[PDB]
């Protein structure tokens, strides 16, 4: 991997522990130009300060709430006007109400169900549709998933079903965008301490189970997701699409 | 043999609905049945189809699964009229026609969330309400399609909604397992129904199964029903979180 | 109901064999049954077990599946004595105890190939011979474990033999489908059996299912039998190449 | 960058070997390579092809993986000549021609076990011997095919051997994980190689990939090499027991 002359859009950095920030450090070290999108004001503040550890000469920052069609549309439109054509997009975005990340899955409200679907799954579809305008001769889109999309897992609840959805959204976008030379793939990350993880029931007892039971007998970090992201986002992976690569110490393969 | 059993079948529109295949089999096997519908026309078709069944009473409730109120009051009224039930057959899905053909990447937010709402979320709330009527346990089965497991031409928004449904099944199985309520899926191969008439390329697929699947023939609604009868009965007492493919073997080949 | 159906059950050792849970269930449903066993310390023993069943007469045949001759002549004799059959329950596996614990990287070539031979290949030759007695179609079922789909501690060489078995089921299903012979697997949860004693860490696993599987309990031989009856009968007519987990929901969680 | 890395590549026969795609990519990235072969002809081809490589010296070892002693001694020799290694690329399978066409249920014992021994078991014993040369960890990658996961036409005995390999991969992963050795598979799409010339319907499968696979084209050996570089380097730290489909997306559609 050498990524000079490539440009990637990274969605979903909130702070220095975001998985997406591990992705940014890996592409930035490999020479990529990076463009960042955020929702909260605070996230933009964290980004402005995090850019200082990065080799990026210019901060390219865009507020995109992927709940709004408008913002996703105008956002990628503006990126294209500012930095020209891009080579792919790292998607690191999900959301559920607290209520819905513990207790009984059977008590999920309609509203918290669809909210999780909207932000964590649907958002990839609209991003794919808008980013593709910026990839007239091909590129790579990567989303972040979790083993809870493949098995029923304690507490993950409404997000499990949103990840199952995301993982199919990836396969369907791969089939659709493939003839355009646009590849689409998931990374299934193992548990990592991030802002978002602090809201998931039983996160610590899962962290520890990995260490004890996963083939590598250790947890992964954001940089390790970064390294697999670079592979997927680069020509090193040009034969690979509709795939989900587990970066989880091997925990997916055992029972 | 399901005498003294009571099942709620959701989703008969007409004589060709998969759920009517379920109904015939369970009726033949001695079960009391209760039916739920959305459209006026479906109650009409239902009243007529009961004349072919051995149900001596018509138990028909209008439940639109987009309304919590209707699901809640629906099942509550079922509880008052027939008492405790032994399982629920979920046979409900919907997507707008334009989201069943062409390019998936062009799917609207509203299109996507409508598919999810009716074809996946509806299972969670139905399970929640139906639970109240199974103090001793019971069985819930949903209807899915292989496009939930793989990207399949045209199926589009519905394939993402089935992937959600199939997951919804695993999560409900885990949640409701301690209450002795099994939750499973049947993944039916393609069958000519009213809804099937709205999916691009249905006919192509139907004939490819016939040519390519291990059994070299398509399945029908009665074969779905017979697998439902297994899953809804004590025959399948140790099975939950499972997706049985009733699809002539198509799922095992490539 | 299975009156006027005939099944070959392969792999009874003692009162605890999964195969015998299958037999009680098929016998209770009125099938005629034929039994195969490996050596004599099942023969005197099998004759005592059958007193429990309602088989009016014992049809018992020595087949060690390591020998083609015994598989071929065994099935030939069956056809001469009992006529055409409706299906086979395959309940047979073997590995050396030393390969069922410790480090999988340390498995011998001989131990690896023995587990393959007896645990997987045998289904292929049994299916070839059985087909001869199923001119109008039929049903073949093998017994597998979740350790064919995931790396699981200790199971080691048998895990790779089951992955092999589970593919064997898919390939047999495609091959024999046009002859209307369905081939499936049941993935049984842990059950206390003669063979289970030689598997490292078995009790640890059994206790864990009870703590963690959706149903919070273990399954038994009879629950395997009930799903076997489904798979062996016309109730499953549209299902082939399938692997049903009878395991309290354990496969669906992580 | 792979300077200061050494990888053993097993199974180049000629310029079209998948393993030679791997070697052109590793050699390009700075690695030192050691090659293993069976036939004298493969050695001849290896000496010819090394003129296209940056490798300053040839490191060729004859290892027929049917022999324990050749594997044990070959790797032992490799350690003595190059010292500790960073990884192995495994690109070895074999079945008799008669088992790559026609009816799977007609496979002989000897042909089934031959394919197992060469195509699956060999990875186990190669892992055990190579582990002696990886005290600080490393990476082992085997080459599989979609046919290990689904019943595919003609592939027959080798599909069951691939199921076996893919499980062999998971079990090696769990086993060698604590030693910091990662074990993974690449599922390559179909590519014109010497051994592909012996597989039934190989041409029609190639063309179907172009017509149906998401990228509407076939892959080549170098694309496998690229993914191999990733699996073999620190880029994939974290990844083990994984199967990456380098196949234009074909695994994910139906
Ligand atoms: N950490 C883990 O254990 C784990 C494991 C597997 C997969 N994942 C996945 O990894 C991804 C990244 O999450 P993380 O763990 O890195 O946590 P995180 O740092 O909290 O990142 C979550 C990001 O989602 C963004 N987001 C949520 N709603 C949004 C919206 N409506 N519009 C735009 N952005 C929105 C947030 O931005 P704002 O702060 O601006 O709202 C935030 O940047 C998620 O998909 C997650 O599900 C996490
Ligand atoms: N045919 C196939 O090839 C196939 C294959 C695999 C799985 N399936 C699945 O099998 C199930 C049954 O469909 P089908 O093919 O039998 O077609 P169908 O006869 O058209 O039945 C579909 C049913 O869905 C109901 N429905 C849709 N929206 C609803 C709502 N908001 N509230 C309550 N009911 C609603 C319809 O009721 P109303 O008419 O009253 O609106 C109708 O009874 C679906 O889940 C479908 O996805 C079908
Ligand atoms: N017990 C469990 O928790 C569990 C779970 C899932 C799957 N399974 C599977 O269930 C099946 C039945 O095993 P089980 O647990 O019921 O134990 P079992 O009672 O000991 O049955 C295994 C049977 O295989 C027979 N067998 C071994 N090698 C043979 C050969 N070369 N030729 C003919 N027969 C041979 C044994 O016969 P002999 O008495 O003559 O040696 C015995 O009858 C096996 O496939 C096993 O892998 C078991
Ligand atoms: N080509 C494809 O479409 C495709 C697709 C998916 C996976 N694969 C897999 O890729 C791998 C490489 O195959 P290929 O297509 O590149 O064909 P290939 O060039 O013909 O290579 C096959 C290799 O296997 C070696 N081999 C067979 N038996 C052996 C033994 N007993 N000991 C040592 N080596 C032995 C051969 O060595 P000798 O010539 O010296 O005997 C040869 O180098 C295989 O695992 C194959 O199953 C291929
Ligand atoms: C169930 C315990 C492990 C969960 C791992 C994990 C942690 C953070 C995750 O990110 C989330 C973002 C929004 C809502 C919920 C989660 C995640 O997806 C997955
Ligand atoms: C992709 C072609 C095969 C489609 C098979 C099939 C047919 C009908 C189906 O039922 C519905 C489809 C769309 C909306 C509502 C219900 C189905 O789920 C699956
Ligand atoms: C891994 C611990 C759970 C074992 C469950 C289990 C028990 C018995 C089993 O049957 C065997 C038959 C012969 C040799 C070895 C095993 C099995 O397959 C699976
Ligand atoms: C089924 C048609 C596609 C075959 C793809 C393919 C081609 C070559 C392959 O390599 C083989 C090596 C030895 C025996 C058999 C095959 C392969 O595994 C897979
Ligand atoms: N399960 C606790 C969290 C405790 C933990 O992290 O282990 C909760 O409901 O948040
Ligand atoms: N099916 C032929 C190969 C010719 C083709 O694929 O057209 C065979 O027996 O090898």
Q: How far apart are CA C240 and CA C236, in angstroms?
A: 8
* Strand order across the C181-188 sheet: C60-62, C32-37, C6-10, C87-90, C138-144, C181-188, C243-246
**How close is the Cα of A194 to the center of ligand 7, in Å?**
40
Q: How far apart are CA A35 and CA A37, in angstroms?
A: 7
Residue B155 DSSP symbol: T
Contact between B214 and D150 using a beta-carbon 8 Å cutoff: no
User: Does residue B168 belong to the interface with chain A, where contact is any CB pair within 8 Å?
Assistant: yes
Lookup: tokens for D237: 């730290």
CB D160 within 8 A of CB C183: no
Q: How far apart are CA C58 and CA C83, in angstroms?
A: 15
- The DSSP string of chain D is --TT-EEEEE---STT-HHHHHHHHHHHTT-EEEEEESSHHHHHHHHHHTTSS--SS--EEE--TT-HHHHHHHHHHHHHHH-S-SEEEE------GGGSSS-GGG--HHHHHHHHIIIIIHHHHHHHHHGGG-TT-EEEEEEE-GGGTSB-TTTHHHHHHHHHHHHHHHHHHHHHGGGTEEEEEEEEPP---TGGGGSTTHHHHHHHHHHHSTTSS---HHHHHHHHHHHHSGGGTT--S-EEEESTTGGGB-
Q: How far apart are CA B126 and CA C190, in angstroms?
A: 32
Q: How far apart are CA B147 and CA C82, in angstroms?
A: 44
Q: How far apart are CA A139 and CA C15, in angstroms?
A: 62
List % helix, strand, coil for chain A (3-state, nearest 5): 50, 15, 35
Question: Which residue from C172, C158, C94, C185 is spatially nearest to C126, judged by alpha carbons?
Answer: C172
Distance to chain C for A152, nearest Cα, Å: 5
User: Does residue C227 belong to the interface with chain D, where contact is any CB pair within 8 Å?
Assistant: no
User: Does residue D117 belong to the interface with chain C, where contact is any CB pair within 8 Å?
Assistant: yes
Lookup: tokens for D188: 């390559």
Question: Which residue from A72, B234, B192 is spatially nearest to C223, judged by alpha carbons?
Answer: B234
Q: How far apart are CA D121 and CA D127, in angstroms?
A: 10
Region for A103 from its dihedrals, namely left if φ exceeds 0, alpha if ψ lies in -120 to 50, beta otherwise: left
Helix (H, G, I), strand (E, B) or coil at B117: helix
Residue B125 DSSP symbol: H
The CA-based dihedral angle spanning residues D190, D192, D196, D197, taken in that order and rounded to the nearest 10 degrees = 140
Residue A251 DSSP symbol: G
Domains of chain A: 1-255 (3.40.50.720)
Q: How far is CA D188 from the centre of its chain?
A: 10
Q: How far apart are CA B120 and CA A114, in angstroms?
A: 10
Residue B62 DSSP symbol: E
Positive or negative: CA dihedral B144, B149, B151, B153: negative
Lookup: tokens for A149: 């999309």
Q: How far is CA C1 from the centre of its chain?
A: 21
C-alpha radius of gyration, chain C, whole number: 17
Q: How far apart are CA A4 and CA A6, in angstroms?
A: 5
Lookup: tokens for B26: 């369970």
B·C CB contacts under 8 A? 128
Tell whether ligand 6 has an atom less than 6 A from the beta carbon of residue B154.
yes
CB C21 within 8 A of CB C49: no
A67 half-sphere exposure, CB direction, 13 A CA radius: 9
C-alpha radius of gyration, chain D, whole number: 17
D46 CB neighbour count, 10 Å cutoff: 23
List beta partners, residue B32.
B6
B76 CB neighbour count, 10 Å cutoff: 13
Cβ within 8 Å of residue A156, ≥6 positions away? A101, A146, A148, A163, A200, A201
Q: How far apart are CA B89 and CA B127, in angstroms?
A: 10
CB A63 within 8 A of CB A37: yes
Contact between B150 and D214 using a beta-carbon 8 Å cutoff: no
The CA-based dihedral angle spanning residues D74, D77, D82, D83, taken in that order and rounded to the nearest 10 degrees = 110
- Which residue minimizes the CA distance to atom 18 of ligand 6? B145
- Which residue minimizes the CA distance to atom 19 of ligand 5? A146
Contact between D230 and A247 using a beta-carbon 8 Å cutoff: no
The C-alpha angle with vertex D201 and arms to D196 and D205, in degrees rounded to 5, equals 85
Nearest residue of chain B to residue A241 (CA atoms): B151
Experimental technique used? X-ray
- The DSSP string of C69-93 is HHHHHHHHHHHHHH---SEEEE---
**How close is the Cα of C94 to the center of ligand 3, in Å?**
7
Nearest Cβ partner of D151 from C151, C159, C171?
Answer: C171
Q: How far is CA A240 from the centre of its chain?
A: 17
Tell whether ligand 8 has an atom less than 6 A from the beta carbon of residue D206.
no
Nearest Cβ partner of B175 from A104, A163, A174?
Answer: A104
Helix (H, G, I), strand (E, B) or coil at B53: coil
Lookup: tokens for B193: 């129904």
User: Does residue D208 belong to the interface with chain A, where contact is any CB pair within 8 Å?
Assistant: no
Helix (H, G, I), strand (E, B) or coil at A88: strand
Cβ within 8 Å of residue D147, ≥6 positions away? B254, D155, D158, D159, D162
Ligand 9: which of A155, A159, A202, A206 to mutate, most ligand atoms within 8 Å of CB? A202
- The DSSP string of B84-97 is --SEEEE------G
CB D20 within 8 A of CB D12: yes
Q: What is the largest CA-CA distance in chain B?
A: 50
Query: In the complex, which subunits touch D with 3 or more CB pairs below 8 angstroms?
Result: A, B, C
User: Does residue B215 belong to the interface with chain D, where contact is any CB pair within 8 Å?
Assistant: no
Tell whether ligand 7 has an atom less than 6 A from the beta carbon of residue C93.
yes
Closest ligand 2 atom, residue B192 Cα? 1
**How close is the Cα of D222 to the center of ligand 3, in Å?**
45
φ, ψ dihedrals at D253, nearest 5°: -125, 160
Write down the H helix ranges in chain B.
18-28, 40-49, 68-82, 109-116, 122-131, 157-176, 202-212, 221-231
Lookup: tokens for C39: 């050596």
CB D188 within 8 A of CB D176: no
D40 CB neighbour count, 10 Å cutoff: 9
* Strand order across the A33-38 sheet: A61-63, A33-38, A7-11, A88-91, A139-145, A182-189, A244-247
Helix (H, G, I), strand (E, B) or coil at C60: strand
Residue whose tokens read 């592979």: A231
Residue numbers of A annotated as active site: 146, 156
Q: What is the largest CA-CA distance in chain A?
A: 49
B145 CB neighbour count, 10 Å cutoff: 25
| B51 burial level (CB within 10 Å; 0-12, 13-18, 19+) | exposed
Q: How far, in Å, are A143, B76, C124 from residue A228 at the CA level?
A: 12, 51, 41
CB B105 within 8 A of CB A125: yes
List beta partners, residue B7.
B33, B87
- From chain B, pick out residues whose CB is under 8 angstroms from the CB of D252: 150-151
Lookup: tokens for A61: 């920052």
Helix (H, G, I), strand (E, B) or coil at B198: helix
User: Does residue B73 belong to the interface with chain A, where contact is any CB pair within 8 Å?
Assistant: no
Rounded to 10 deg, the angle between the C109-116 and D109-116 helix axes is 130
Query: In the complex, which subunits touch A with 3 or more CB pairs below 8 angstroms?
Result: B, C, D
φ, ψ dihedrals at C30, nearest 5°: 85, 15
Q: How far, in Å, are A157, B7, B50, C28, C89 from residue B3 at the CA level?
A: 36, 11, 18, 19, 29
Tell whether ligand 9 has an atom less than 6 A from the beta carbon of residue A202.
yes
Nearest residue of chain D to residue A182 (CA atoms): D215
Region for D159 from its dihedrals, namely left if φ exceeds 0, alpha if ψ lies in -120 to 50, beta otherwise: alpha
């Amino acid at each position: 991997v050498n990524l000079e002359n490539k440009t990637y859009v990274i969605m979903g950095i909130a702070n220095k522990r975001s998985i997406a920030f591990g992705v940014a450090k890996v592409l930035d070290q490999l020479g990529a130009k990076l463009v960042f999108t955020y929702r909260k004001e605070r996230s933009r503040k964290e980004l402005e300060k995090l850019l200082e550890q990065l080799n990026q000469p210019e901060a390219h920052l865009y507020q995109i709430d992927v709940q709004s069609d408008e913002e996703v549309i105008n956002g990628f439109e503006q990126i294209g006007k500012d930095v020209g054509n891009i080579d792919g997009v790292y998607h690191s975005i999900a959301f559920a109400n607290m209520e819905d990340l513990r207790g009984r899955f059977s008590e999920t409200s309609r509203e918290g169900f669809l909210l999780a679907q909207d932000i964590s799954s649907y958002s990839l579809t609209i991003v794919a549709h808008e980013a593709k305008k910026l990839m007239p001769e091909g590129g790579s889109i990567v989303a972040t998933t979790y083993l809870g999309g493949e098995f029923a897992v304690q507490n993950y609840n409404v997000m499990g079903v949103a990840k199952a959805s995301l993982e199919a959204n990836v396969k369907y976008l791969a089939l659709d965008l493939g003839p355009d030379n646009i590849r689409v793939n998931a990374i299934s990350a193992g548990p990592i301490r991030t802002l978002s993880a602090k809201g998931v029931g039983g996160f610590n007892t899962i962290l520890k189970e990995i260490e004890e039971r996963a083939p590598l007998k250790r947890n992964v970090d954001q940089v390790e997701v970064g390294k697999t992201a670079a592979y997927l986002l680069s020509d090193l992976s040009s034969g690979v699409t509709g795939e989900n690569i587990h970066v989880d110490s091997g925990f997916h393969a055992i029972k």
